Write a protein that binds this ligand. Structure first.
Ligand SMILES: CCCCCCCCCCCCCCCCCC(=O)OC[C@H](COP(=O)([O-])OCC(O)COP(=O)([O-])OC[C@@H](COC(=O)CCCCCCCCCCCCCCCCC)OC(=O)CCCCCCCCCCCCCCCCC)OC(=O)CCCCCCCCCCCCCCCCC
Ligand SMILES: CCCCCCCCCCCCCCCCCC(=O)OCC(COC(=O)CCCCCCCCCCCCCCCCC)OC(=O)CCCCCCCCCCCCCCCCC
Ligand code: HEA
Ligand code: HEA
Ligand SMILES: CCCCC/C=C\C/C=C\C/C=C\C/C=C\CCCC(=O)O[C@H](COC(=O)CCCCCCCCCCCCCCCCC)COP(=O)(O)OCCN
Ligand SMILES: CCCCCC/C=C\CCCCCCCCCC(=O)O[C@H](COC(=O)CCCCCCCCCCCCCCC)COP(=O)(O)OC[C@@H](O)CO
Ligand SMILES: CCCCCC/C=C\CCCCCCCCCC(=O)O[C@H](COC(=O)CCCCCCCCCCCCCCC)COP(=O)(O)OC[C@@H](O)CO
Ligand SMILES: CCCCCC/C=C\CCCCCCCCCC(=O)O[C@H](COC(=O)CCCCCCCCCCCCCCC)COP(=O)(O)OC[C@@H](O)CO
Ligand SMILES: CCCCCCCCCCO[C@@H]1O[C@H](CO)[C@@H](O[C@H]2O[C@H](CO)[C@@H](O)[C@H](O)[C@H]2O)[C@H](O)[C@H]1O
Ligand SMILES: CCCCCCCCCCO[C@@H]1O[C@H](CO)[C@@H](O[C@H]2O[C@H](CO)[C@@H](O)[C@H](O)[C@H]2O)[C@H](O)[C@H]1O
Ligand SMILES: C[C@H](CCC(=O)O)[C@H]1CC[C@H]2[C@@H]3[C@H](O)C[C@@H]4C[C@H](O)CC[C@]4(C)[C@H]3C[C@H](O)[C@]12C
Ligand SMILES: C[C@H](CCC(=O)O)[C@H]1CC[C@H]2[C@@H]3[C@H](O)C[C@@H]4C[C@H](O)CC[C@]4(C)[C@H]3C[C@H](O)[C@]12C
Ligand code: CUA
Ligand SMILES: [O-][O-]
Ligand SMILES: [Cu+2]
Ligand SMILES: [Mg+2]
Ligand code: NA
Ligand code: NA
Ligand SMILES: [Zn+2]
Lengths: 227, 94, 514, 46, 84, 79, 58, 43, 259
């Protein structure tokens, strides 16, 4: 989850999210460098009483400041697209889970074997147990096996929603009539939080997502008990 | 087939359209449709700038293909020079 | 006479003045809505109500700022005032149709205000996506009034685009080629081409939403074989060109301001600037699905849209470097308009660069529908389009009015606004990277510090807006009349005096061919 | 014809700066006030 | 293509009148014959209350709310089937 | 033939993020197979793979609506 | 039909200071008044309708 | 630019009045609405 | 007095009455869709027609009767009309995109096929082919009208323009009959939606274009056009060819390929 005064991304919980962190570090360095260069050059242009107001020939220097940005863009696009196609690669999941968005909560279906499904609603602020997080906890968490490739399928039974979990690098829109797929793999046990990420009406801010990542044998027994 | 009955512009153009038409036929351009062609622009052979008043704005494209046009009021009297290239212009009021 | 002049106008200057007044009033509305947003978010918990009232405010904020403040001021206001003067033309090509472009806007605005007064308002986002905006989740008249508001604004701008393109192509001095017209005129021509091509597609999409809502069509409804995502394509096919429409006249005014207060007779690299604006205009039509990287599109389509979007940095970079090269060697005049333009160059660059971050579809999965997007577009809109509007307003106010502003007050105003907008939006990058979603009325507790700071920033910007009104009042109250303006040889719009006569260029300029 | 010159090419009078202050106050104030009163209207509906 | 016709020399009123009466209106006449010749009602198919057809998410703003604007009782079933 | 089914495998026909048609096709295939069998006398057991795949992939409400429409005679796919 | 454009040209070029939308004669003023009355009255009526629609009606 | 001295100079006191009136025209009506928000919500 | 060739237009009320008619039509549609009343809408349609009539009347006064359409002014009007047609093309492009989006990827609700289960399309070789021949023929006859006008031939201009209008009317009547006879409706899912909204806006443009041709017919009867100056006729002909080309795209896309 996010923590107070956080500046950057939530710590990565999945290898893909780790890849995104390093790619963001690379891109932000370039962003910093170019912004700072432009600010510096502005100050340089403005700090001399020397003048030169006659016509200036442009041809030579426009080569520099076309070719240099083109090279920089290529230096961004290459790692960007590598991660894109990595995130797309075939992986062979062990488990498929569906989630359906609704106004205003998520339901989950685990129907590889038995017909397991339940609804997952925000815990009202007045009912939080001590130490629980305002607007983030749910009554029924999305229990999942850690260290395993999971296929998430996402849809909606009413308006648009979007199913997100920032620390896993996931955001898949929930569209009625459409079954969108993403894959999820947590390197660690724990609790990982997300929030509805497409405006969906009166309680858009109040339909969060909580994944609970545990060893397979715990997930199996939990699954059985949820039937 | 064939036959007539459609008026011509000669017959039926009126107002400013007709003035422009009749002037063009005489080779004249009172409504500034054409670009004037430059003289050599010396003080001896200044560009001659018609006006219906005693001043008119000139735009000077000093060199072929300059994208910057140099604009100034030209007043009745002694020829004036473009402030960028010095080419001469003289107002001819009428 | 008053009605003939101000309701029946066929005069490009008076119609420009009408647009500037309309846009200034809209700007107050838009500012009030922005303060309601930030009041709701300025402490954790709920201030106004749930997300419906909150997102009616957000939705109206955006529509007002875009369609009633920026476009009327830049295109209807500076465009009508300056384009005919900068080409020596005696008015617009269609001076009477021009007046209808203006008068469609108060009705368009009335329809938007009606949408927020009836039922529970249109709490849809300015993108108006179905099915939230459809007749089950937004039953009643509010969304239809919003659609009709957009229809009228769209007709206004399409007819205005026809007027500007025709005027700029057809009414220059016969010796003046397109490569002898000023960059602001180019910027308006290209913006008008974008308006002409993109707004009809928006009109098509929102008409389909209207019939899905009222005539039982199902363009966007899966039950009939429709698709919500089709709406998104049609909307963003307009909506990406629209953001270039919002900035291009700003680029044009920045070129004139930087050139003027550098003491230069011309911008650096004129044909490069023309090339860059045309390139940006063209590339702005082939990138729209970067608004759709999380909807489930195939990976090769995501790779194409990532790459095509990033290319626009190259022509845009040529413009930024050319503005810097215009400053180079200048006799710099530190006027208030120059300060707006310098702040523009830097802060626009920052927002353009976070836009390049977002163009990466892999990273956009995590940034999409978060405040990192909000930060990107307010750097280019609140510190780009708005800074160009303020710079142009302070630079050309003496031309339009015949009176001078107090330059010390105008610099104070710039200083306050600069602090305010940066305090508002810079922390929103942190909120975005750390996962705060868009269109939320309240947030998990961890996000409190940057939301508090951001809201405090928005109040500083409010103080700047109030001070702007006083500064305009003080100028009209004191009546310091303009005498001499420098550099008229390369700023033709000043050469008829301040204010110019009702009719200018009754006798056209003399320009020979040589 | 129409009046020309500073203070005459506008639809509002600048002949008295205090009347002008009132007019500008009503003009910009009404635009800034409107969203607050629409919010109130929506709150007092339900 | 050059189509298969032939003239020019001058494209003029006479040529376009020739095309109007010699090609365009004869083609309209032929298609009019073809059409008013294949008219004659088709059998209306069995009514099936498919959920993607006869959509009603809001009543129409005319009539009883349930009839389309150019409703033809012979061939346009209502959501509950053919009327009367 | 033997089981050990865990979940639906990658299917090269549906390699992209939109999996709507994968659910639909396997639903059709199951019910087509099942109709074929219950006729000629044979065993719906041969249809089982399609049944497992569509149950894995398809939202419960989609299956339920499609089942209701088949019973109603309003299912628009060909079975 | 005979060509009466010349007499229309005389009428609409008469030096009488009238704007083109009124220069045909009294019929222009009547049609103008009808149009503007419908527009302004209809606009007031639309504002009444907004007033009506802005509030809940049992 | 050069300009004439003000035709109708606006003294510092006059500017203080114009600035005060301008700020109050924005702040009072919104302040009234926000002060009475609870009144609105409760109702 | 001016010494350029452009037109300074007298101050005019029609921009304002046009803008207000737009307010009345849109608020009128809202009232019709949500408050069961046609009143505002009928006022808006009436003031809209009044505005268009008086505005274009004044343009005729300014040109035929006052002589303000110099060649430079006409050239601007040519660009204006071309740009207007371009915006109309892009408007139709949105509906063609909707049609191809839905028909190339038919969803499960349709049966996963195009045309959808339960849709029985019109035969494109019957009335739709007839309407194609009708608009193509009208494109030939309007070209004859244009050449007759340029050659100074009043009678054959009028004959050809009358034939063009008659064909426009024939198309509209055929299309109205086919709308009544069609066994599917606008509420028949995305097939009906795309079919009727796209051909419906096309039919509206045929009516607009026919009205514009009729205006030209009566102006021609009153001798307004000269053999060299007749931009209103040229504009109506360009608009008419645009309506014909949109029909050809609809016929190939929706009636034929989409059947
Ligand atoms: C109520 C509406 C009011 C309209 C104004 C009426 C003013 C009457 C004043 C009479 C003095 C000079 O010559 C003139 C000729 C006028 C020709 C009018 C054509 C009328 C439309 C007919 C359309 C039929 C099209 C259908 C094709 C399919 C048919 C299917 C059956 C002069 O005169 C120039 C004036 C005309 C130029 C501007 C015309 C703009 C016309 C459009 C406004 C109306 C829109 C209707 C279109 C929508 C569909 C009906 C004198 C002429 C008066 C009659 C004008 C009728 C216009 C309608
Ligand atoms: C425009 C800066 C803070 C930072 O370390 O940000 C780091 C990253 C995330 O990084 C991490 O994950 C590790 C964080 C390290 C923690 C160390 C503690 C830092 C102390 C707390 C900082 C207080 C923040 C100030 C709060 C600021 C409130 C306003 O966040 C971000 O990317 C924010 C993304 C910003 C992208 C816009 C770039 C604009 C550049 C303009 C500068 C040019 C010249 C400046 C000079 C500009 C002069 C005009
Ligand atoms: C004035 C308005 C404006 C402008 C000009 C832009 C310009 C750009 N925008 Fe922006 N954008 C918006 C307004 C604008 N945007 C809005 C409103 C939204 C949100 C819509 C909504 O959902 O409501 C948005 C959303 C948006 C998204 C969607 C993100 C999401 O929703 O998840 C993306 C993604 O690619 C994007 C990218 C860019 C890019 C690459 C540019 C480029 O044009 C920027 C190019 C400029 C530079 C790069 C800086 C100058 C260049 C140099 C100094 C050269 C060297 C630089 C490099 C080598 C990189 N924008
Ligand atoms: C031009 C566009 C523009 C501008 C200028 C602004 C300016 C501001 N915006 Fe907004 N905003 C949007 C367009 C804009 N915004 C859009 C498109 C959205 C997305 C909507 C959606 O999600 O659907 C958005 C969303 C948005 C949000 C996110 C809401 C959410 O996700 O829940 C927030 C929150 O802080 C915000 C705040 C502000 C603030 C505090 C300002 C302030 O900086 C404003 C300060 C005041 C000014 C800048 C004055 C403006 C007036 C003039 C310039 C008149 C000048 C007068 C003369 C020239 C005479 N905006
Ligand atoms: C040649 C013969 C036909 C000619 C054209 C006839 C009508 C054209 C009218 C306008 C067309 C514009 C689109 C309106 C949308 C739908 C009309 C589609 C064409 C049509 O007429 O569709 C009819 C339905 O009309 C209906 O719903 C309701 C029809 C009336 C309601 C119109 C609602 C207003 C539409 C809003 C317009 C917004 C425009 C914005 C433009 C902005 C541009 C910048 C089909 O009838 P049916 O009974 O369903 O099926 C036949 C069964 N036997
Ligand atoms: C949901 C319902 C929404 C309804 C919204 C409706 C809103 C608008 C109400 C429209 C009222 C229109 C009244 C007639 C306007 C005629 C304009 C015209 O004809 O303008 C002409 C120029 O535009 C030209 O040519 C070429 C351009 C002609 C455009 C004609 C009008 C188009 C109006 C609709 C545009 C829709 C765009 C659709 C495509 C997306 C002439 O220009 P003027 O400056 O007048 O004169 C110049 C003088 O020299 C002439 O002698
Ligand atoms: C480059 C443009 C290419 C356009 C056409 C691509 C058609 C691809 C389908 C090929 C046959 C199978 C499907 C694509 O659907 C669709 O409608 C595509 C619909 C067209 C969208 C085109 C965007 C441009 C619109 C303005 C012109 C999923
Ligand atoms: C909704 C209801 C729509 C109802 C139907 C409207 C039908 C359009 C009628 C237009 C009549 C215009 C008559 C004025 C005219 O045609 O004016 C001509 C100028 O063209 C000009 O402005 C050309 C100006 C007109 C362009 C009009 C194009 C159609 C616009 C229709 C609205 C679009 C709606 C879109 C809906 C999606 C006059 O110049 P000339 O002809 O050279 O004559 C001069 C010679 O006589 C001198 O010798
Ligand atoms: C986001 C934009 C708004 C920014 C913040 C505005 C700053 C507010 C300025 C003051 O506004 C006033 O505040 C008073 C309180 O100080 C209110 O008086 C209220 O409270 C008083 C004191 O309790 C009573 O005397 C009054 O009757 C009662 O109306 C008064 O109505 C309101 O106009
Ligand atoms: C200017 C913006 C206008 C917004 C328009 C909203 C639509 C209003 C139409 C409603 O009109 C009302 O309907 C009532 C019940 O039928 C009755 C009443 O007498 C009538 O007035
Ligand atoms: C040829 C054309 C106009 C030159 C003129 O007639 O004045 C110029 C103007 C801007 C130029 C372009 C811009 O300077 C940007 C690019 C700069 C690179 O150095 C070459 C390609 C590049 C894309 C240039 C190609 C070409 O020289 C352009 C397109
Ligand atoms: C996004 C749009 C489909 C819109 C729709 O669903 O209605 C589609 C239609 C044609 C597509 C393009 C064409 O298929 C051509 C290219 C194919 C490449 O594999 C991706 C880029 C590529 C340039 C495509 C991008 C995108 O998928 C496009 C533009
Ligand atoms: Cu569900 Cu937002
Ligand atoms: O839109 O960027
Ligand atoms: Cu974009
Ligand atoms: Mg989203
Ligand atoms: Na809050
Ligand atoms: Na011709
Ligand atoms: Zn020179």
């Amino acid at each position: 989850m996010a923590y107070p005064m956080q500046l950057g991304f939530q710590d990565a919980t999945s290898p893909i999210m780790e890849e995104l962190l390093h790619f963001h570090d690379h891109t932000l360095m370039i962003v910093f460098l170019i912004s700072s260069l432009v600010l510096y050059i502005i100050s340089l242009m403005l700090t001399t009483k020397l003048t030169h107001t006659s016509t200036m020939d442009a041809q030579e220097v426009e080569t520099i400041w076309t070719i240099l940005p083109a090279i920089i863009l290529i230096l961004i696009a290459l790692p960007s697209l590598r991660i894109l196609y990595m995130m797309d690669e075939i992986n062979n999941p062990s488990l498929t889970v569906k989630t359906m968005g609704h106004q205003w909560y998520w339901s989950y279906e685990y129907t590889d074997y038995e017909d397991l499904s339940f609804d997952s609603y925000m815990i009202p602020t007045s009912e939080l147990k001590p130490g629980e997080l305002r607007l983030l906890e749910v009554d029924n968490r999305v229990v999942l096996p850690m260290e395993m490739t999971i296929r998430m399928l996402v849809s909606s039974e009413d308006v648009l929603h979007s199913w997100a979990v920032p620390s896993l690098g996931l955001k898949t829109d929930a569209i009625p009539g459409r079954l969108n797929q993403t894959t999820l793999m947590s390197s660690r046990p724990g609790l990982y939080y997300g929030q509805c990420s497409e405006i969906c009406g009166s309680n858009h801010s109040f339909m969060p997502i909580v994944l609970e990542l545990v060893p397979l044998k715990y997930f199996e027994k939990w699954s059985a008990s949820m039937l | 087939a064939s036959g007539g009955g459609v008026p011509t512009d000669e017959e039926q153009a009126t107002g400013l359209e007709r003035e422009v038409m009749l002037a063009a036929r005489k080779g004249q351009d009172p409504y500034n449709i054409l670009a004037p062609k430059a003289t050599s622009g010396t003080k001896e052979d200044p560009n001659l700038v018609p006006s219906i008043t005693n001043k008119r704005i000139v735009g000077c494209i000093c060199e072929e293909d300059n994208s910057t046009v140099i604009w100034f009021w030209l007043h009745k009297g002694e020829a004036q020079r473009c402030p960028s290239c010095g080419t001469h212009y003289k107002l001819v009021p009428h | 006479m008053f009605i003939n002049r101000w309701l029946f106008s066929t005069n490009h200057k008076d119609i420009g003045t009408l647009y500037l007044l309309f846009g200034a009033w809209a700007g107050m509305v838009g500012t009030a809505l922005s303060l309601l947003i930030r009041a709701e978010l300025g402490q954790p918990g709920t201030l106004l109500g749930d997300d419906q009232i909150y997102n009616v405010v957000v939705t109206a904020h955006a529509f007002v700022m875009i369609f009633f403040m920026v476009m009327p001021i830049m295109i209807g206001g500076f465009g009508n005032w300056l384009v005919p003067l900068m080409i020596g033309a005696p008015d617009m090509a269609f001076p009477r149709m021009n007046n209808m472009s203006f008068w469609l806007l108060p009705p368009s605005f009335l329809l938007l205000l009606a949408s927020s007064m009836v039922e529970a308002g249109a709490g849809t986002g300015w993108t108006v996506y179905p099915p939230l905006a459809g007749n089950l989740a937004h039953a009643g008249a509010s969304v239809d009034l919003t659609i009709f508001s957009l229809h009228l604004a769209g007709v206004s701008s399409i007819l205005g685009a026809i007027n500007f393109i025709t005027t700029i192509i057809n009414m220059k001095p016969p010796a003046m080629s397109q490569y002898q017209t000023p960059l602001f005129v180019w910027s308006v021509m290209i913006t008008a081409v974008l308006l002409l091509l993109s707004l009809p597609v928006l009109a098509a999409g929102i008409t389909m939403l209207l019939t899905d809502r009222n005539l039982n069509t199902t363009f966007f409804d899966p039950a009939g074989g429709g698709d919500p995502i089709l709406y998104q394509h049609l909307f963003w096919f307009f909506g990406h060109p629209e953001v270039y429409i919002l900035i291009l006249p700003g680029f044009g005014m920045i070129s004139h301001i930087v050139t003027y207060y550098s003491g230069k007779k011309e911008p650096f690299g004129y044909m490069g600037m023309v090339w860059a604006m045309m390139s940006i205009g063209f590339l702005g039509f082939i990138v729209w699905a970067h608004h759709m990287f999380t909807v489930g599109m195939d990976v090769d389509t995501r790779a194409y849209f990532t790459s095509a979007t990033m290319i626009i940095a190259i022509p845009t970079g040529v413009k930024v470097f050319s503005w810097l090269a215009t400053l180079h060697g200048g006799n710099i005049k530190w006027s208030p308009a120059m300060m707006w333009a310098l702040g523009f160059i830097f802060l626009f660059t920052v927002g353009g660069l976070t836009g390049i971050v977002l163009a990466n579809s892999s990273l956009d999965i995590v940034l999409h529908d978060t405040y990192y997007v909000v930060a990107h577009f307010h750097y280019v809109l609140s510190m780009g389009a708005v800074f160009a509007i303020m710079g142009g307003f302070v630079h050309w106010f003496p031309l339009f009015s015949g009176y001078t502003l107090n330059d010390t007050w105008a610099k104070i105003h710039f200083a306050i606004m600069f602090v305010g907008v940066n305090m508002t939006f810079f922390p929103q990058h942190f909120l975005g990277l750390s996962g705060m979603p868009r269109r939320y009325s309240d947030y998990p507790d961890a996000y409190t510090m940057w939301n508090t700071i951001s809201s405090m920033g928005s109040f500083i910007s409010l103080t700047a807006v109030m001070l702007m009104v006083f500064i305009i009042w003080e100028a009209f109250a004191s009546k310091r009349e303009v005498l001499t303006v420098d550099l008229t040889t390369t700023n033709l719009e000043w050469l008829n005096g301040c204010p110019p006569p009702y009719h200018t260029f009754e006798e056209p300029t003399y320009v020979n061919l040589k | 014809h129409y009046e020309e010159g500073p203070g005459k090419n506008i639809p509002f009078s600048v002949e008295n700066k205090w009347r002008l202050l009132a007019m500008m106050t009503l003009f910009f104030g009404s635009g800034f006030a409107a969203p607050f009163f629409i919010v109130r209207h929506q709150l007092l509906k339900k | 293509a050059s189509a298969a016709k032939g003239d020019h020399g001058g494209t003029g009123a006479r040529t376009w009148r020739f095309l109007t009466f010699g090609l365009a209106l004869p083609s309209v006449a032929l298609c009019t014959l073809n059409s008013w010749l294949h008219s004659g009602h088709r059998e209306r198919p069995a009514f099936i209350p498919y959920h993607h057809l006869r959509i009603r998410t809001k009543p129409f703003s005319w009539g009883d709310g349930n009839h389309t604007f150019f409703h033809n009782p012979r061939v346009n079933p209502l959501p509950t089937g053919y009327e009367k | 033939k033997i089981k050990n089914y865990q979940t639906a495998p990658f299917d090269s026909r549906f390699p992209n993020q939109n999996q709507t048609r994968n659910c639909w096709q396997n639903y059709l295939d199951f019910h087509r197979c099942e109709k074929a069998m219950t006729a000629k006398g044979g065993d719906v057991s041969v249809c089982e793979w399609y049944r497992r795949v569509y149950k894995s992939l398809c939202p419960i409400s989609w299956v339920s609506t499609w089942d209701d429409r088949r019973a109603e005679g309003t299912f628009p796919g060909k079975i | 039909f005979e060509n009466r454009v010349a007499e229309k040209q005389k009428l609409f070029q008469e030096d009488n200071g009238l704007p083109v939308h009124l220069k045909g004669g009294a019929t222009d003023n009547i049609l103008y008044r009808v149009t503007m009355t419908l527009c302004l009255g209809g606009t007031l009526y639309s504002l009444y309708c907004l007033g009506w629609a802005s509030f809940p009606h049992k | 630019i050069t300009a004439k001295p003000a035709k109708t100079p606006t003294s510092p006191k006059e500017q203080a009045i114009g600035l005060s009136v301008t700020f109050l025209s924005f702040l009072l009506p919104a302040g009234w609405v926000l002060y009475h928000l609870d009144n609105y919500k409760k109702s | 007095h001016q010494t350029h060739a452009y037109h300074m237009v007298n101050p005019s009320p029609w921009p304002l009455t046009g803008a207000l008619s737009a307010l009345l039509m849109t608020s009128g549609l809202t009232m019709w869709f949500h408050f069961n009343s046609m009143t505002l809408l009928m006022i808006g349609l009436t003031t809209n027609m009044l505005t268009m009539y008086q505005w274009w009347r004044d343009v005729i006064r300014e040109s035929t009767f006052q002589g303000h359409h110099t060649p430079a002014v006409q050239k601007g009007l040519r660009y204006g009309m071309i740009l207007f047609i371009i915006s109309e093309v892009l408007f139709f492009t949105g509906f063609f995109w909707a049609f191809y989006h839905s028909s190339l990827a038919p969803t499960p609700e349709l049966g996963g096929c195009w045309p959808p289960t339960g849709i029985h399309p019109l035969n494109p070789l019957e009335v739709p082919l007839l309407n194609t021949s009708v608009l193509l023929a009208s494109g030939v006859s309007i070209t004859w009208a244009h050449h007759s006008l340029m050659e100074g031939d009043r009678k054959h201009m009028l004959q050809a323009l009358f034939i063009t209008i008659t064909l426009g009317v024939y198309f509209t009547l055929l299309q109205a009959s086919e709308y009544y006879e069609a066994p599917f409706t606008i509420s028949d899912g995305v097939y009906g939606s795309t079919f009727f909204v796209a051909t419906g806006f096309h039919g509206l443009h045929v009516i607009i274009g026919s009205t514009f041709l009729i205006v030209c017919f009566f102006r021609q009867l009153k001798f307004h056009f000269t053999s060299n100056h007749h931009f209103g006729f040229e504009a109506a002909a360009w608009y008419w060819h645009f309506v014909d080309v949109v029909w050809l795209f609809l016929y190939v896309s929706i009636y034929w390929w989409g059947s």
